[PDB]
Symmetry: C6
Subunit: 194 residues, 6 copies
């Protein structure tokens, strides 16, 4: 995974953002992108390769992995990062538009404050929504056994996941990181309210 372009744009955002937003961006880079790269991807590298079902039926492991894990966890977290980053991109775009206008003619006020606050609200909504969606897809514990009754599987088969404990650890970790980001958005909103 290459996050260099997003990294550059978010650094530009960091130049124009509140201290709490600088903290939020640092959290994003260190505790979500860095981990997703260094640690989580290796854990999920063999999710399907080391997924074993007790059956001789051709095709049952495939459909039962697809049923157990409709979307992989690491893939969901990628999308979460992207969608909680988008509003900051919108905000910095608005800011640079106004700066370009200034240059053509020749500190949050007016439209920039409305846009910044609205972007905080959007990040909050996206984050809450991704947490909720995760909870409904998988909850927050991967059990080692998965029982599957999807055709072509005869009757109910037993299947076994790779690394359920490590995956549970990282699921809970990323949830905690998301909640911290949420608290930080709340702090931004409070600070502004004052």
């Amino acid at each position: 995974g290459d996050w260099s372009f997003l990294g550059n744009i978010l650094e530009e955002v960091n130049e124009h953002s509140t201290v709490i937003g600088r903290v939020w961006l640092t959290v994003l880079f260190i505790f979500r992108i860095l981990i997703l790269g260094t640690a989580a991807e290796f854990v999920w590298g063999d999710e399907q390769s080391d997924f074993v079902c007790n059956t001789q039926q051709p095709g049952c492991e495939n459909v039962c992995y697809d049923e157990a894990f409709p979307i992989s966890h690491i893939r969901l977290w990628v999308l979460q990062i992207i969608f909680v980053s988008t509003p900051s991109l919108v905000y910095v775009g608005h800011a640079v538009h106004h700066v370009r206008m200034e240059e053509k003619r020749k500190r949050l006020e007016g439209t920039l404050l409305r846009t910044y606050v609205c972007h905080i609200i959007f990040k909050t909504l996206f984050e809450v929504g991704f947490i909720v969606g995760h909870y409904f897809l998988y909850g927050f514990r991967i059990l080692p056994l998965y029982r599957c009754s999807r055709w072509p599987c005869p009757n109910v088969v037993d299947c076994f996941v790779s690394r359920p404990t490590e995956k549970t650890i990282f699921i809970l970790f990323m949830l905690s990181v998301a909640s911290v980001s949420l608290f930080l958005n709340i702090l931004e909103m409070s600070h502004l309210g004052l």
Copy 2:
């Protein structure tokens, strides 16, 4: 995949482009290249390795994968990115040609406006065409079962795809991204019309 050269040229384009075009380029980089790298490629890494057919015939899995997936989805999306980027390259080339002419002698008007509008039209056509072609090759849902009657397969065989649900998710996602890009081209054209 290395997109650094294209990234540089498209940043140069971004220096010379309308706000809506800046948004379009941001979408291109974040929601198509970044995803294709970080997420989709891992999903399609084992498309043929974990593609199982119920048969003892040597060669049937190979021909039935070739028949089920004439071109892989990720490979089609690569080409889509390239072809919708080409017109912007043409436009910036024309612009830098005129700037070089200016320098030799020693803000869209005349040929640059015609070229920019024509490039918007080309991007629109390419995008619509790729969407249509995808729909006819695969539609927008990968089913888990594929029935195959291609020689050397005896009679009709059953074959099973890896990760059909995740792939359906990402297919729909990329379709939505393409439609957003299309709406943005429409906004460019309207803005200019005013």
Copy 3:
């Protein structure tokens, strides 16, 4: 693993840090990140692939690897690096906040000294805690044999780990590096006390 962003921020910290802290950061980069990348990851690449159990039961190898190694060692060390780096990030953030304030108006004293000392204390606590947690999960010797009685394993099965001696070597090495970092934090605190 990509540590470039953290590397940049920690270099900025290095610009503003005591000689002992510069040494600590050099240790962090050379004896923990560099090793974890170059050496340890190759050792742990086949932890589950070359993990063999004497059984015909489907699913027993998976659950017995999950039981033997709840979290992989390399994954634990990643998190250790991140958490012992966080306080330095907080400290440099505070410092740059005060510098930005100075610029708006137009050498450790006051809040910066309190914050720096408190950050040293936090690094010390995190380091000690990670060492302790490692000791309780695995101790400091990976034995070649692991006996497993987790369902679906019939009775107690014998299982065998890949590369236990090399892994023991690197476990002890990283422990020694952590203890050196701890001694360096102590030296920082003493130097300041004078």
Copy 4:
């Protein structure tokens, strides 16, 4: 594959080259190197791994793959890129030699025009030759079945290729790119003739 050095030298060439040559270099980078990296290599990754022959003879798959694909397609395209890039390197070398001479003493004319035109001719010859050679090795359609009668294969065996349709697609695509480059060289020569 790392093309950074060649990329740098060809950018230097781009600084000193006609508009049509700038277009040719853009084509080279985007439609040949970028594709070969992002798309074609993944298609050819399992050319021999997923190449199956109907036989129990040890060694027949190996010799029959060597016979079916004497040189892999992606490897041929690498060499094509290199050889059509070489003349531009010669041209820019000549140019920088003359510039260095100018500096020692203290816009195509004379030897630079002869060299540039001769380099266009060389690129044209190399491109035509690679197209022809490809046609004679493989034509432009990979069939799914390959019949092989090379020792140690008993009688004639049947063998099956991985991804023949996708490979045919990319073969035709790269052929079209080569023909476009050829047309561009023709345009250069015409422009100069005027």
Copy 5:
């Protein structure tokens, strides 16, 4: 493996070092890091995957690889590089400390000469020690056959190593590089003595 940070710091050292030390650093980068990356790692990639024992006992290959190769050769060379680089880091740290002091107030003498000479001595000791340790672990020839009598192996089993001749070649090569580095340290010490 990423050696960029160490590379940067050692370039800074190169700015402040004797000609013989510049040669030593060039040797380090070209004949140890470059080789370890480009060549040796590919040789050792399948050390355990292609390590075959003549037995049906589950677990015997694992314990017999662990016994034959307690630590892999490439992993030992990584640590050797790191430990022979550390003293140069100490020396440049001392130097930059004194330069920072100079700046606060506003060519090897005094403490810098003592530190530089002591660092040469440390590199010499570490290098000699790593050579000796290698000799005692493995000597300098990997034989193709390894006989193993470690539980659970019944009686004495025969096991076979991957690529023993290539590995012997690279072992001897790296030994010669180490001895050259040693001679260079001797030359440094002599030059200073004059």
Copy 6:
């Protein structure tokens, strides 16, 4: 493989080198390093994995691959590049030493001419020697069949190589590149003689 450091140093050499030497360095980078990376490594990736012997004896494939290919071809070419690059490093080191001396006080003549000519001679010797050594290890054609009578192989066994034709192609190609480099060294020596 990472050749960035060597690339930088050789660019510095290019700043101080004759036109023929600039050509030689361009050849080195484009026709040896670039190819070895992009093309040859993929060809040799499965040299041992797809090396099949007709036998049930455990250990015979391993010893017969070690006997057929004592050192892999790509590994030999790595070392060839390094050793033919070393003299240029020596030459630029001598040059920068003299420039540093000049600076302390405050166009090939004297020691620099002797050193440059001697370095050309060294490159010539190393190149000729590597060509000769290759010829004696393997000649210049990899045959598909290899007959092996090394213990534990019973009697003489038949073994089969992966991709012998592609490998023969690249062997001949690299030989031709080496001979071109040799001709270029001869041209350097002649030019100087005048």
